[PDB]
Amino acid sequence: DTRTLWTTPDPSPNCKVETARDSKLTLALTKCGSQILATVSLLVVTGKYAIISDTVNPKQFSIKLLFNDKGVLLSDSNLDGTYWNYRSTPYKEAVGFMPSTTAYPKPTDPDKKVSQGKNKIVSNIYLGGEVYQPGFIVVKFNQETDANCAYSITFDFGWGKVYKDPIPYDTSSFTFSYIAQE
Amino acid sequence: DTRTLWTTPDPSPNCKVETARDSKLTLALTKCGSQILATVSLLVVTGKYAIISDTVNPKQFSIKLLFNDKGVLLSDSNLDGTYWNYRSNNNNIGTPYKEAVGFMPSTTAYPKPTTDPDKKVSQGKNKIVSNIYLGGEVYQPGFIVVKFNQETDANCAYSITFDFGWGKVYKDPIPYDTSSFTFSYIAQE
Amino acid sequence: TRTLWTTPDPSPNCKVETARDSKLTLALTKCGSQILATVSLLVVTGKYAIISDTVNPKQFSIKLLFNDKGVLLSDSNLDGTYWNYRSIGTPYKEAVGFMPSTTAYPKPTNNTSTDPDKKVSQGKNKIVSNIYLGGEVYQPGFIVVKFNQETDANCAYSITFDFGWGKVYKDPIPYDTSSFTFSYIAQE
Ligand SMILES: CC(=O)N[C@H]1[C@H]([C@H](O)[C@H](O)CO)O[C@@](O[C@@H]2[C@@H](O)[C@H](O)O[C@H](CO)[C@@H]2O)(C(=O)O)C[C@@H]1OC(C)=O
Ligand SMILES: CC(=O)N[C@H]1[C@H]([C@H](O)[C@H](O)CO)O[C@@](O)(C(=O)O)C[C@@H]1OC(C)=O
Ligand SMILES: CC(=O)N[C@H]1[C@H]([C@H](O)[C@H](O)CO)O[C@@](O)(C(=O)O)C[C@@H]1OC(C)=O
């Protein structure tokens, strides 16, 4: 299915939050012409961020997906590449899933000011899906330079509310979209 | 694909919050291949939650869409199935649909609910949680929780549940009339 | 499955307070009977370019007004020069399939034309969310998207973006929004 690129819907541990494969990132990208429709959720399984409270610091971490100029996931990404593939051999290109570098340029007169906001999508998510357990997600397009990436999608996850009773970092699903490179 | 399953865009009262058809649920599910793109909004028209304030309790209610193995709406659902159907223009195909499995939330992504950290099942991923705004006013937050496959009622194969509520103190009564909310989810097929 | 858009890296193309004082980036993509949209706003000069608690009002309104063919009316805050389908071209002739449904989101009615037997939703034609200035989690603002709620220019359809904030900002910050995704039911 050339219209869906994903982690598979029920992944094994596939994502580094603190150490490699300590988390399960479920990410599906679906191509709707020139816009990608995405859904993302994160379950931290082991380690520092599996169960959080107010004494865990910092209260944010970053998950980078780094892509080359063919849209292939680079091995330095926090997301393990083993099962990152079209919905059904590692794929050879996925440029049409990549966030536009014209809409969302890599970092570099009022008419020369570059938007610092437009390459980010920021919202609350809710741990365990509970309305009284807000956290946040920041989706960032093409803001990384690591591994000489041509494209990137970064997920920053965190929280700010004071939690004295420890709770699993297990996020509600978040929908977003972005302008595709082609 | 690219078909829509919906309540019609201008439904008559079609949904139970407290009693049958005491509310207008507008819900459209549009298939974008492996994901469903959805928009939902609720106007409660009569009963306990039509007009809310800080003296209305509890401050949450639940609307269950329960589906069988063909993705057909079960009678126990809060939504009346009379006008829950595939789109035709601004209305519905006349005959009740026979199957809608491609519109169901995946039971692989969102399994039905059932100490080893390695076997932990995500409690978050089957829910989408956000503020909505009553009357579309920025100063009238409430909330929506969309839940996939979390019901057991009527031996459903699939479910979509909408929990609506609010937390802010409203001393003056206001209608429970939500801003539209967009979400997507992984489709069963 | 076409996209109607401002182009992804627009030149100043929008009036918040004065012509060309802002850059609105907006893409509408058709997915059958729903439009999938992404929007963001960079105010580049004037009252709302750098905001703080001493600026009032703390909301402003960007109207996209369309005629019966889905064509952008020049009265809109958005300049229509580069509002067109994604692809040297011609202004588009029709985009009704991209308009917000007037059955889902009807225009306001008069005392004359209001049916007292029907309760009309005031919320359903609005989408309301936070956006974040600079994409910083500690700089919330808000966006309100409104469908078909204008009467300006005898529009057949409209999409209105209200942007604002409520948090007290002592130190001034640029009104430069994170991107916001939404969808709506299309006219056809
Ligand atoms: C959509 C949105 O951001 N709404 C928020 C409104 C809004 O900012 C104002 O009505 C616009 O002027 O403000 C809310 O309350 C905040 C309060 O939470 C904060 O601590 O103080 C500010 C004033 O400085 C407001 O009083 C509101 O009216 O309830 C919050 C609301 O946002 C949310 C997420 O509910
Ligand atoms: C989904 C929602 O609306 N969650 C809100 C929650 C809820 O309304 C009450 O818990 C209901 O009782 O109230 C809060 O104050 C809270 O932290 O608990 C704020 C929280 O909203 C945010 C943006 O974090
Ligand atoms: C994305 C998010 O959740 N931002 C929240 C922010 C954040 O949690 C801390 O800044 C992290 O440390 O905290 C706030 O109190 C703040 O104003 O700064 C509330 C704000 O949420 C809203 C709905 O405005």
Residue numbers in the entry:
A (entry chain A): 179 to 266, 273 to 292, 298 to 371
B (entry chain B): 179 to 292, 297 to 371
C (entry chain C): 180 to 266, 271 to 371
Paper text:
The HAdV-D36 fiber knob domain (FK), which mediates the primary attachment of many HAdVs to host cells, has a significantly elongated DG loop that alters known binding interfaces for established adenovirus receptors such as the coxsackie- and adenovirus receptor (CAR) and CD46. Our data suggest that HAdV-D36 attaches to host cells using a versatile receptor pool comprising sialic acid-containing glycans and CAR. Sialic acids are recognized at the same binding site used by other HAdVs of species D such as HAdV-D37. Using glycan microarrays, we demonstrate that HAdV-D36 displays a binding preference for glycans containing a rare sialic acid variant, 4-O,5-N-diacetylneuraminic acid, over the more common 5-N-acetylneuraminic acid.
We employed glycan array screening with a library of about 500 glycans to identify SA-containing glycans that support efficient binding of the HAdV-D36 FK. Notably, HAdV-D36 FK demonstrated selective binding exclusively to 4-O-Ac-3’SL, contrasting with the preference of HAdV-D37 FK for 3’SL. Glycan probes containing a 3’SL motif capped with the unmodified Neu5Ac showed little or no binding. We solved the crystal structure of the HAdV-D36 fiber knob in complex with 4-O-Ac-3’SL isolated from echidna milk, and we observed that the lactose component is not ordered in two of the three complexed glycans and does not seem to contribute to the binding. The only detectable contact mediated by the glycan stem is formed between the poorly ordered O6 atom of the galactose moiety and a backbone carbonyl function. The lactose stem is generally poorly ordered and only partially visible in one of three cases.
